[PDB]
Design a protein around this ligand. Sequence first.
Ligand SMILES: CO[C@]1(C(=O)O)C[C@H](O)[C@@H](NC(C)=O)[C@H]([C@H](O)[C@H](O)CO)O1
Length: 160
Amino acid sequence: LDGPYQPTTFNPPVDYWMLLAPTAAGVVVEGTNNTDRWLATILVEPNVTSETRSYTLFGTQEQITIANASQTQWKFIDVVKTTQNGSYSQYGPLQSTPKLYAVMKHNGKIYTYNGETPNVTTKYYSTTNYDSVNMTAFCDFYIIPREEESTCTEYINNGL
Ligand SMILES: CO[C@]1(C(=O)O)C[C@H](O)[C@@H](NC(C)=O)[C@H]([C@H](O)[C@H](O)CO)O1
């Protein structure tokens, strides 16, 4: 567990999980290869009926319709597009009590956590030039090698 690091944009090594510890609802992390993949993770508060919100994604204001069916858990949503002018689509989510998320560049993809704490799993998004994707963290974060993924999973499920 290397960190906490303050918000910044950098090029994380492949096969490391970037464990994010946001404190507020909103954009958590975003990264793109500038060609066929844009991913931004948004943290939505517990208990939200369908509504459109404005988020700044990659420097520009975007309207996204979100919801969170859970009465008590947070919802992390990956908002992605596959071309520069394409529409954002939602995948995931991760329903969470600890408020932690993580993202990793691995084997031609970007992986993120998914499901419902305390029994999370991971999902992925194929991404060309996956190894050079820079990630912008909007909150404090830690770095954990993939070899220690069981430790990252325990933090996502139960907190630091
Ligand atoms: C093309 O197949 C895949 C991929 O990227 O390898 C399979 C992968 O399991 C799926 N992941 C999820 C969370 O649905 C992903 C997304 O649907 C797509 O990347 C969204 O842009 O599509």
